[PDB]
């Protein structure tokens, strides 16, 4: 189930290893337009959360 636009729910993800090459298989999207960082090399940057 998904929440409405006015009651968007925020989820916190931390303390784990993230691989961004497995998120394509979970949804049939093709655009994945991204703003601040290239999706090609998201796997070589350490975030905070």
């Amino acid at each position: 189930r998904f929440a409405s636009v006015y009651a968007w729910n925020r989820k916190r993800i931390s303390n784990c290893v993230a691989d961004y090459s497995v998120l394509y298989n979970f949804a049939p999207f093709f655009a994945f337009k991204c703003y601040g960082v290239s999706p090609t090399k998201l796997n070589d940057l350490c975030f905070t959360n």
């Binding site: 601040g36 960082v37 290239s38 090609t40 090399k41 070589d44 940057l45």
Partner: protein
């Protein structure tokens, strides 16, 4: 380099090269005038000697 893919990283780093070249050129431009003033002063000092 580590956050953007080549086809836009080349554009991003191009905006720094021009600015740094323009900043570097003014230094030698002003040094070329200070050198002329110092040369005139040195000629005056030699004549006075």
């Amino acid at each position: 380099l580590s956050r953007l893919d080549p086809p836009e990283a080349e554009v991003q780093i191009d905006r720094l090269i021009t600015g740094r070249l323009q900043s570097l050129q003014t230094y030698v431009t002003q040094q070329l005038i200070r050198a002329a003033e110092i040369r005139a002063s040195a000629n005056l000092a030699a004549t006075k000697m």
